Amino acid sequence: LSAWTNQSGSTLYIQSVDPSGSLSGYYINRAAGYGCQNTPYPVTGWVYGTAITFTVLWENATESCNSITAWTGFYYQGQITTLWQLVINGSTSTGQIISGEDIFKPS
């Protein structure tokens, strides 16, 4: 399996990419100031050539953060460049969706 670590120290663990492009994996968040660190969270998404999307549900056996992240990005020159959006359960405005950029490199 295929591990990718971003600038914050978080790691995407890719367990499979189906011939359909269906991606399955887990994620360990290590980003300072966020909840749900150091423990595995499930990943689903798509790979289409060098394009990728993947999303993480922030609940597991031990810690919940009432939120989901979706990454949209692309593989080029040894890195996956992504834009992410994080939505909190019970939100009432797109104003409350949090966003940023993660760069992932092989680890």
Name the one range near a second copy by CB under 8 A: 8-16, 30-38, 50-58: 50-58
Q: Which of 14, 23, 54, 84 binds ligand BTN (CB under 6 A)?
A: 84
Nearest distance, CB of residue 77 and ligand BTN, angstroms: 20
| Virtual torsion, Cα 41, 15, 100, 46, nearest 10 deg | -120
Where are any strands of DSSP class E within 1-107? 2-6, 11-17, 22-28, 40-48, 51-59, 64-76, 79-88, 98-106
Q: Which of residues 25-64 bind ligand BTN (CB under 6 A)?
A: 29, 31, 34-36, 58
Q: Is 38 in the site for a second copy (CB under 8 A)?
A: no
